[PDB]
Amino acid sequence: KAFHLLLFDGSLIFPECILIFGLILLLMIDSTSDQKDIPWLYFISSTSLVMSITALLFRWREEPMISFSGNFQTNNFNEIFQFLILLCSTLCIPLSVEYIECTEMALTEFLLFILTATLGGMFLCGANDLITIFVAPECFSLCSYLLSGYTKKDVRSNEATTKYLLMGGASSSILVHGFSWLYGSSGGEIELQEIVNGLINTQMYNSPGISIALIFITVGIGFKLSPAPSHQWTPDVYEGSPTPVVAFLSVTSKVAASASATRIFDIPFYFSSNEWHLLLEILAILSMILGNLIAITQTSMKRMLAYSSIGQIGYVIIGIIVGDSNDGYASMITYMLFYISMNLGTFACIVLFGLRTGTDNIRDYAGLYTKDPFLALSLALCLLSLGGLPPLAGFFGKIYLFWCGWQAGLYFLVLIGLLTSVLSIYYYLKIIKLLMTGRNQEITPHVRNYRRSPLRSKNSIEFSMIVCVIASTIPGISMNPIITIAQD
Amino acid sequence: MDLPGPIHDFLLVFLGSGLILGALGVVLFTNPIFSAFSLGLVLVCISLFYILANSHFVASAQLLIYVGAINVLIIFSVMFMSGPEYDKKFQLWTVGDGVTSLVCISLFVSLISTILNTSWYGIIWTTKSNQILEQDLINASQQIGIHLSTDFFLPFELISIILLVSLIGAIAVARQ
Amino acid sequence: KETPERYTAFVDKADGYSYVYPSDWREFDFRAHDSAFKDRYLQLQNVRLSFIPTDKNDVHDLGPMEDVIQTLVKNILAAPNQMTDIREIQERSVDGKNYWTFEYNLTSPNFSVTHFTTLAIANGRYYTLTVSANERRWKRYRNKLKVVADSFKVFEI
Amino acid sequence: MILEHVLVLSAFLFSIGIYGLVTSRNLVRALMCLELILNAVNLNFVTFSDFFDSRQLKGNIFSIFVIAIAAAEAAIGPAIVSSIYRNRKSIRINQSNLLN
Amino acid sequence: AVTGVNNQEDLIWVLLKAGVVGFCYFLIMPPIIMNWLRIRWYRRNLLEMYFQFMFVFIFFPGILVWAPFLNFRKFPRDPTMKYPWSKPENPSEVKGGFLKYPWATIEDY
Amino acid sequence: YEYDIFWAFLIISSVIPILAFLFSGILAPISKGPEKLSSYESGIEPMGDAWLQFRIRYYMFALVFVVFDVETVFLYPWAMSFDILGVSVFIEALIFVLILIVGLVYAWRKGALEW
Numbered sequence A: 001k002a003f004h005l006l007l008f009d010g011s012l013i014f015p016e017c018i019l020i021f022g023l024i025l026l027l028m029i030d031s032t033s034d035q036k037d038i039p040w041l042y043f044i045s046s047t048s049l050v051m052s053i054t055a056l057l058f059r060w061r062e063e064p065m066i067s068f069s070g071n072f073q074t075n076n077f078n079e080i081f082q083f084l085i086l087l088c089s090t091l092c093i094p095l096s097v098e099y100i101e102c103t104e105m106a107l108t109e110f111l112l113f114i115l116t117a118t119l120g121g122m123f124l125c126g127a128n129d130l131i132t133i134f135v136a137p138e139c140f141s142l143c144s145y146l147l148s149g150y151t152k153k154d155v156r157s158n159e160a161t162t163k164y165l166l167m168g169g170a171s172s173s174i175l176v177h178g179f180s181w182l183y184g185s186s187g188g189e190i191e192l193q194e195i196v197n198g199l200i201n202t203q204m205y206n207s208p209g210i211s212i213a214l215i216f217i218t219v220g221i222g223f224k225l226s227p228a229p230s231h232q233w234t235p236d237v238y239e240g241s242p243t244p245v246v247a248f249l250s251v252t253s254k255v256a257a258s259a260s261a262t263r264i265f266d267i268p269f270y271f272s273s274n275e276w277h278l279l280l281e282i283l284a285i286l287s288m289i290l291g292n293l294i295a296i297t298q299t300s301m302k303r304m305l306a307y308s309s310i311g312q313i314g315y316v317i318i319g320i321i322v323g324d325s326n327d328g329y330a331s332m333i334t335y336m337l338f339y340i341s342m343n344l345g346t347f348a349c350i351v352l353f354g355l356r357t358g359t360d361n362i363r364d365y366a367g368l369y370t371k372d373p374f375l376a377l378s379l380a381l382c383l384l385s386l387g388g389l390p391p392l393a394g395f396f397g398k399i400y401l402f403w404c405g406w407q408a409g410l411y412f413l414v415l416i417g418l419l420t421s422v423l424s425i426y427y428y429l430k431i432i433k434l435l436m437t438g439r440n441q442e443i444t445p446h447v448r449n450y451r452r453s454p455l456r457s458k459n460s461i462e463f464s465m466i467v468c469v470i471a472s473t474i475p476g477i478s479m480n481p482i483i484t485i486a487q488d
Numbered sequence B: 001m002d003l004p005g006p007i008h009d010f011l012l013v014f015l016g017s018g019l020i021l022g023a024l025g026v027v028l029f030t031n032p033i034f035s036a037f038s039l040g041l042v043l044v045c046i047s048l049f050y051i052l053a054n055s056h057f058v059a060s061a062q063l064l065i066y067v068g069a070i071n072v073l074i075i076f077s078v079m080f081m082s083g084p085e086y087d088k089k090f091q092l093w094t095v096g097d098g099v100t101s102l103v104c105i106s107l108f109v110s111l112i113s114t115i116l117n118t119s120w121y122g123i124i125w126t127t128k129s130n131q132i133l134e135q136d137l138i139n140a141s142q143q144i145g146i147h148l149s150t151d152f153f154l155p156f157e158l159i160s161i162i163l164l165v166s167l168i169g170a171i172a173v174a175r176q
Numbered sequence C: 001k002e003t004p005e006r007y008t009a010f011v012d013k014a015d016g017y018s019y020v021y022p023s024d025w026r027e028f029d030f031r032a033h034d035s036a037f038k039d040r041y042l043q044l045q046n047v048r049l050s051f052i053p054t055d056k057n058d059v060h061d062l063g064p065m066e067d068v069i070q071t072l073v074k075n076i077l078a079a080p081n082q083m084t085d086i087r088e089i090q091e092r093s094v095d096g097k098n099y100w101t102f103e104y105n106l107t108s109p110n111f112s113v114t115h116f117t118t119l120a121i122a123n124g125r126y127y128t129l130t131v132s133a134n135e136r137r138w139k140r141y142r143n144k145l146k147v148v149a150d151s152f153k154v155f156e157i
Numbered sequence D: 001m002i003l004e005h006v007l008v009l010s011a012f013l014f015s016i017g018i019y020g021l022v023t024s025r026n027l028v029r030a031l032m033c034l035e036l037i038l039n040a041v042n043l044n045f046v047t048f049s050d051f052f053d054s055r056q057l058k059g060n061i062f063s064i065f066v067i068a069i070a071a072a073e074a075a076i077g078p079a080i081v082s083s084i085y086r087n088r089k090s091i092r093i094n095q096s097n098l099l100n
Numbered sequence E: 001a002v003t004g005v006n007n008q009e010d011l012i013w014v015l016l017k018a019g020v021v022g023f024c025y026f027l028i029m030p031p032i033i034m035n036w037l038r039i040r041w042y043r044r045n046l047l048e049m050y051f052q053f054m055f056v057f058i059f060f061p062g063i064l065v066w067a068p069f070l071n072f073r074k075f076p077r078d079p080t081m082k083y084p085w086s087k088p089e090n091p092s093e094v095k096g097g098f099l100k101y102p103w104a105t106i107e108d109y
Numbered sequence F: 001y002e003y004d005i006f007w008a009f010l011i012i013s014s015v016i017p018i019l020a021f022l023f024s025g026i027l028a029p030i031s032k033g034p035e036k037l038s039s040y041e042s043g044i045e046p047m048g049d050a051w052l053q054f055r056i057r058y059y060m061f062a063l064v065f066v067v068f069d070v071e072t073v074f075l076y077p078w079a080m081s082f083d084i085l086g087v088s089v090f091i092e093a094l095i096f097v098l099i100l101i102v103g104l105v106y107a108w109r110k111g112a113l114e115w
Helices: A005-010 A014-032 A038-049 A054-059 A074-101 A108-125 A132-146 A153-171 A174-185 A193-203 A209-223 A233-239 A243-265 A273-292 A301-322 A336-357 A371-387 A393-407 A411-423 A430-435 A458-472 B005-028 B032-053 B056-079 B095-116 B119-122 B140-149 B155-175 C065-075 C135-149 D002-024 D027-052 D058-076 D078-086 E009-040 E046-069 F004-027 F058-080 F087-109
Strands: A063-068 A072-074 C006-012 C015-022 C035-036 C046-049 C051-054 C083-095 C097-107 C112-122 C126-136
Touching: A005 F087, A014 A038, A014 A054, A014 B155, A014 F087, A038 A074, A038 A108, A063 C035, A063 C065, A074 A108, A074 A193, A074 A243, A074 A336, A074 A458, A108 A132, A108 A243, A108 B119, A108 B155, A132 A153, A132 A174, A132 A243, A132 B155, A132 D058, A153 A209, A153 A233, A153 D002, A153 D027, A153 D058, A153 D078, A174 A209, A193 A273, A193 B119, A209 A243, A209 A273, A209 D078, A233 A243, A233 A301, A243 A301, A273 A411, A301 A336, A301 A393, A301 A411, A336 A371, A336 A458, A371 A393, A371 A430, A371 A458, A393 A411, A393 A458, A393 D078, A458 C097, A458 E046, B005 B032, B005 D002, B005 D027, B032 D002, B056 B140, B056 D027, B056 D058, B056 F058, B119 D027, B140 C126, B140 D058, B140 F058, B140 F087, B155 D058, B155 D078, B155 F058, B155 F087, C006 C035, C006 E009, C015 C046, C015 C126, C015 C135, C065 C083, C065 C097, C097 C135, C097 D078, C097 E009, C112 C135, D002 D027, D027 D058, D027 D078, D058 D078, D058 F058, E009 E046, E046 F087, F058 F087
Parallel strands: none
Antiparallel strands: A063 A072, C006 C015, C035 C046, C046 C126, C051 C126, C083 C097, C097 C112, C112 C126
16 A cells, blocks of 8 residues: 555644654553653653644644544644643643652553543544544543542542542533434534534434534533533542642643534534523533632632632633634633643642642641742742732733623623632632731641752742743733634 | 344334343342343343344444453452342332432433434435445445544544553552 | 466356356355356455346447446446546447446545446346456456456347 | 334433433442443444445444443443452442542 | 346256255265264274264264164174073083273274 | 344244243253252352452453453454555554553553463
8 A cells, every 4th residue: 555645644643643652662661671760751751741842833834634534633723722731741740740759659650641641632622523522532531530549549539530430421421422413413424514514414403403412512521621510520539639630630621621612612513603602601600600609618728729620611611602703712722821820830839738748628728938938929829810810810811801701792701700700819818818827826737847848849840830920921911812813 | 235124123122122121120220240231131232233223343343342341340240349139139219319210201301302303214315425335345344444444543543542541540540 | 477367257148148257256246236256365356247127229229428438437336435537438349239348446535446347238138247456456457357348248038 | 114213212221321320329330321321322323324324334433432432431440449449348439428 | 036146057956966965864874874883893993983973973963863763782692592581502602701901802892 | 135044043042042941841840849949069058148259459351351352343344454455554553453562561561460
C-alpha cells in the first residue's frame, strides 16, 4: 500500500503522538529498570508536556483541516483549548510529583494516568465525529476513575471512587443513548457537520426523537461540567481525593467538556437553539445560585473549592448562551485561561499547606500569615482573584463575561451572576479572615509546628508562575482577546 | 436477506420476553450470583438480537467479550461478598425503591411515547443511497474490517491506549 | 516460464452461456449471482455472472453503446461513494451475437477495484459477466483476466 | 415487520438498568446495571445501523467500541471493588456516607 | 431449476451411487470390519491396531446395527461339544494350560 | 438462506436437553429420602455451606483477560481486511500488538501473573 494517507494525517496529531511516545517510553523504562528516580520522571513528564506545546504552536498558522476521514478537526477554536489542556497538565505535574512521592506510593502510574487524561482531553477538543466524542472522554473519565482513588488506603478515597464511577457510568451512557437517538433519526450520520444535513434529508429535524437526544446530550455534558443538579458528583470526589488529581479534574475536565459542549451545541444543534438555550440558562442560573449559596457554609477547604468550581462554571456557560455573534466564545476563553491560573494557584497553596501541615479543615488555616507570610499572601491573592476582586484576573474576566451577556440582552443572567458574585465574597474572605488571626489561642497546633524550611520546592515555582499571572494579566486583557475573537 | 416474516416476528417477541425476564432477574435478585446469571441470559438474548438484525460479527464480539466479563463478575462477586446466602432471595422493598420505580416508569413512558409516535419506516425510504452496498464486498465482516481499518483510525488506537491504561490501573488498584 | 496460465471452461447449457476462468480458482456462491469463481487466497479477485429478464433481442437495442455503458456504470454497477472511470470499451461479434466488454475502476475512499464487464442480450436474458481484481494487483493480472472477459459466449438454450 | 419493537425493548432495558442503578445495595450489581444500560444503547445502535446504515456499518462499529468501553469499565471495577473490600470489608454502598 | 445451482447430475444416477455407497457402508463393510476385529485381535501391532480403530471409528454407524445381531462368545476347548450336556469322547486330546503374556506366544492367544 | 439453518440448529440443540430431562422424568423412578438428599462430603457430615473466598492476588489474571479479549476481538476485522488494503493496516495493527505486548510485560513484571 502507501501508508501515506495516514502518514500525512498522522502529522496533524503530532502533539498527541509526542504524548503517546512519552507515555510509552516512561512505561517501558518503569518496566525495564527496578530502581525508581524522581528527577527522571519529572524530566520525562515535563519534556512530554513542553514538546506538545512546542509542536502545537508550530501548527497554529496551518490551514484548518478534517483528517482521519471525518474524525479529527484542526482549526483555531480547538487549538486554544488543546493549549489550555497542555498548560493545565504542565502546571499540575509539579503539584503531583511531590504529593504522590510524600504518600510513599508509585508515581509512574500517576504520571501515566495524568498523561493519558491529557491525551484524552486533547482529542476531545477536536473530535469531529460521534464515536470519538465518546471514546476520547472515555480516555479521560476512566483515568479519572483510576485517579481520585489512587490513594487506595484512605476510607474517603474508596467512597469517592465509588461515587465517581457510579455517577459517571450514569452519565456517559445517557450521553451515548442521546448519541444513538441522534444517529438514528438522522440517516446514519455521525460526523459533526453532517447530521443537520442528514436531519433535513430525512426531514426529522422537528421529530420528538431529536428532543430526547438534545436532553440526553446536555445532561451527559452537564455532568462533566457540573452545573445545576448534575453537580452532586463534584464535592464528595473533591473532598475525598488527593489534591493534585482533584486540581487536574478541576481545570482539565472543564476545559475539555466546555470544548465538547461548544462543538456539540453549535455545529450539530444550531437548528434547535431555542431549546438548548433554555436548558443552558436553567443549568447556569441553578449552578451559580446553588454553588455560591452552599459554599458559604463549608468547613472543608477542598469541598468549598468544589462548590466554588460549580459556581464559576455558570459564569462560563453564559459565553455559550450568548453565542458567537456578541463575542461569546471569545469570553469562554480569556476567562477559562484566567480560571486555570486562579484554581491551580489556590490548589498549589492548599497542596503545600497540607503537606507541611497535614490537614484540610478551614479552621486550621488560622495564623498562617505569622508562620508563612508568602504562602498566606499567595493564597489570599488566588482567593481574591476567585471572588472577582478588582485588581485581579477574576474581576476583568467577569466584566468581560457580563459585557457580552448585556450586549445579547440577557439581563436576568447577568443580574444573577452579579448577585452570586456578591455572595461569592463572604467565602474567599472567610479564609483570609482566618489567615489574619493573631490570636494565639485560636491558632490550631497544626500550624504552630509548621516548618517552612530553607528550600524552594517545585510547587513554589509552579505557583509563582501563577500568582504573578492572576495579578499581572489585568493589564494584558487586550493581548488575550485578539487571539480569541480571531477564532470562529 | 432475512428470515421468513412470521418467524422473524415470533423470534422478536420470544427474545424480547427472555430479555425482559433476564433484566427483571437482574434488578430483583439479592444474590449478585443469581443476578449475574440473569445478566448472562440478557447477554445471550442481545447477541441473538444482533444475529437477527444483520450483525453476525457484533453478536460474536458481544458473546466473547461479555461472557468474559460475566465470568470475571461472578468470580469477583464470589470473592467479594459474604456467605453463599441462598436465603437472601429477592431483597426487601422500601419507599426509596417505590419512588424510583415511579420515576423510571415515567422515563420509560416518555421514551415509548416517542418510539410509538415516530414512523421509523419513513426514515428508511429517505436513506436510500446509504443502503447501496459495494458489490465486491460480499462478506459483511469484510466490510466491517475495511471500515474499522480506514474510516475509524483515531478511535482504533485510542481504544488501545484506553485498554492498556485500564489494565495498568486494574493491576495497580487491586494489588494487595 | 512455461506455457501460460491454464484455464478451465465453465459451460451452463441450461442457462445457455459459457466462459473460461483460471484453473487455480475455486467455485463459490456469490450472493444472488448465477455462477461465480474466485481465487483461493487473494480477495476481490473473482468472476461472477447473473442475468436479468429482458425483452430486447440484442445489446444494440439498449441504445448508444457509450451512453448506456456510462449510465450502467454510474447508476447500477457502483455504490454512490465510489468514483468511477472507464478506461477501455470494446465490441465483439460472433455468430450474429454482440458482446460489449468495458474496463472500469471503482475507487472508493477505502479501497479501489478494477473490473472487466461483458454485457450480452440473448435468450430473453441480459448477462453481466464481471471479472474483478484489486487495483494494486491489477497491472499484473489484467491480461490474465482479459482472456476471461474475451471468453464470454452466449448460445441458444 | 415489527422491528420497531426492538427499540421498545431497548428503552425498557435502559429504564430497568436505570432502576437497577439506583436501588443497588451492592456495587457489583450497580456495575451490572451499568452494563445493562450500555447494552440498551448498543441495541439501539445496532438496530439503527440495520435500518439506515447497511453499507457503512457505523452503528456496528460504534457498538464494538461501546462494548470495548464497557469491558474497560468492568476491568477498572471490580478492581476498585477489590480496594474497597480490602480497606473496609463491606460492599454496601449506601452504608458509606462519610463524605456528606 | 433455480439460479445458483449448475450442472447438477440426474437424480436417478445420484440415487444409484448413494445406494451403492450405502450398500457398501451399512451391510457389506461392517461384517468384514468386525471379523477383522475378532480374528487377529491378539496379532495386532501398533499400526494394525491404529488402522482397526480408525476403520471402526469411520464405519461405526454401520456397526451399531450389526452388533446387536452378532455374538462373539468364545467357543469350547474341544471341537466335539455339540451341547452343554454332551460329553467328550476321550478327555485327553484337549489342550489345557494356555499360558499368558510373560511366557506365551501368539499360538496360546 | 445461510442463517435459518442456524436458528433451526439452535432450537434443536436447546430442545435436546429438554427431551433428555423429560425422558429421564418419565423413565427413571423417584425414591427420595432425607439421607439421600444430604450434600456429599466424603461420608462425614458437611460443615458450613461451601464458600471459599480466594485471595485477590490469585485471581488478578481475570482483569488482564478482560482487556486481552477486547484486543483479540479488535484484531480480527483488521485481519479480515489485511489483503484488500496494504501496509497501512499493517502499520495500524502493529501499534495494537505492541501495546498488547507492553501490557503483558507490565502484568508479568508487576506480579499480577504470579501464583
